């Protein structure tokens, strides 16, 4: 049992909660997690989390994993895949039941290339969704099954209020990432995207293949794989969009009125 929905009360009066192609934009107050938890537990949903920790960024893993244990997908099956050039530096963090961690030794194109190769491996047969995040981050509040859908991106925290001409899309037509000044729905950040395994195979292959074309042509998109992620999600629109609750920098941007929760935040 849970509260009845209120047809004549808006979930939010201050923000857009559904895109013009009818994908939910996920903010606090738009979902009842008790309903979603039951839906996804009935399918025994398993979520894979990829994170890269190369060179000095191995230092971020301890807090990243400790705080993921408190706030990411708790109660669901989770498998962490840590891609790193220093496997001995992976901290031994104690995980809750139903949660596992694998270390994948590596191994600008690297993240799309490596997630593409990995996403095609038969050892993911049991994993239903992949979530791909930056490591220099911590979880401060719930990040759960409300994000899961065939394909999602996350609104970049510096640009959610910006008009599209101000978005830092790739603007040179000789790049595979090019987006004209009069096109674009949102500016998505490269630091949190995901979807079903099949949709993440598709996105990461397309971005990697596009990056290889630009390399052959002697061009590097302005924001590297984030430029390619934005061209891809313009042409293949996501089935949910995460609000900046899911990707925030409090030191830079504070705690604005429209953020009811700060869920996953940058570490200085």
Ligand X SMILES: O=c1ccn([C@@H]2O[C@H](COP(=O)(O)OP(=O)(O)O)[C@@H](O)[C@H]2O)c(=O)[nH]1
Q: Which residues bind ligand X (CB under 6 A)?
A: 3, 11, 16, 20, 29-32, 51-55, 57, 134-136, 190-191
Least distance in Å: CB of 50 to ligand GAL?
14
If one asks whether residue 190 binds ligand GAL (CB under 6 A), the answer comes out as yes
If one asks whether residue 24 binds ligand GAL (CB under 6 A), the answer comes out as no
Coil vs helix vs strand at 92: coil
Burial (CB < 10 A; 0-12, 13-18, 19+), residue 217, is exposed
Given 69, 146, 226, 245, which residue is catalytic?
Answer: 226
Active site residue 226: yes
Q: Give 54's strand partners.
A: none
Which run of H or E residues covers position 102?
Answer: strand 99-105
Least distance in Å: CB of 191 to ligand X?
4
Read off φ and ψ for residue 5, nearest 5 degrees.
-60, 150
# of chain residues touching a second copy (CB under 8 A)? 45
Touching Mn ion, residues 161-190 (CB under 5 A): none
Chain-centre distance for alpha carbon 108: 18
Q: How many CB atoms lie within 10 A of CB 38?
A: 11
CA angle 69, 73, 86 (to 5 degrees): 50
Judged by beta carbon distances under 5 to 8 A according to partner kind, the member of a second copy, ligand X, Mn ion, none in contact with residue 161 is a second copy
Judged by the rule CB under 8 A, the positions of this chain that interact with a second copy are: 1-22, 24-26, 30-32, 35-36, 39, 146, 155, 160-161, 163-164, 182-186, 237, 240, 258
Judged by the rule CB under 5 A, the positions of this chain that interact with Mn ion are: 134, 136, 191
């Amino acid at each position: 049992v849970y509260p009845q929905p209120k047809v004549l009360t808006p979930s939010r009066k201050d923000v857009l909660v559904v895109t013009p192609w009818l994908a939910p934009i996920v903010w606090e107050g738009t979902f009842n997690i008790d309903i979603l938890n039951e839906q996804f537990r009935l399918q025994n949903t398993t979520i894979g989390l990829t994170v890269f920790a190369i060179k000095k960024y191995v230092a971020f893993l301890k807090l990243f994993l400790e705080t993921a244990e408190k706030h990411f997908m708790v109660g669901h099956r989770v498998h962490y895949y840590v891609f790193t050039d220093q496997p001995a530096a992976v901290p031994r963090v104690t995980l809750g039941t139903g949660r596992q961690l694998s270390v994948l030794e590596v191994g600008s194109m690297r993240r799309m290339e490596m997630i593409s190769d990995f996403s095609e491996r038969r050892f993911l047969s049991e994993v239903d969704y992949l979530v791909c995040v930056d490591v220099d981050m911590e979880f401060r509040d719930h990040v759960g099954v409300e994000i899961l859908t065939p394909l999602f991106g996350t609104l970049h925290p510096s640009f959610y209020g910006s008009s599209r001409e101000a978005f830092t899309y790739e603007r040179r037509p000789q790049s595979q990432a090019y987006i004209p000044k009069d096109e674009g729905d949102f500016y998505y950040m490269g630091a949190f995207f995901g979807g079903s395994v099949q949709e993440v195979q598709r996105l990461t292959r397309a971005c990697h293949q596009a990056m290889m074309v630009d390399q052959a042509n002697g061009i590097e998109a302005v924001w590297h794989d984030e430029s390619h992620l934005n061209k891809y999600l313009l042409r293949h629109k996501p089935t949910k969009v995460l609000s900046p609750e899911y990707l925030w920098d409090q030191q830079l941007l504070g705690w604005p009125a429209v953020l009811r929760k700060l869920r996953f935040t940058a570490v200085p």
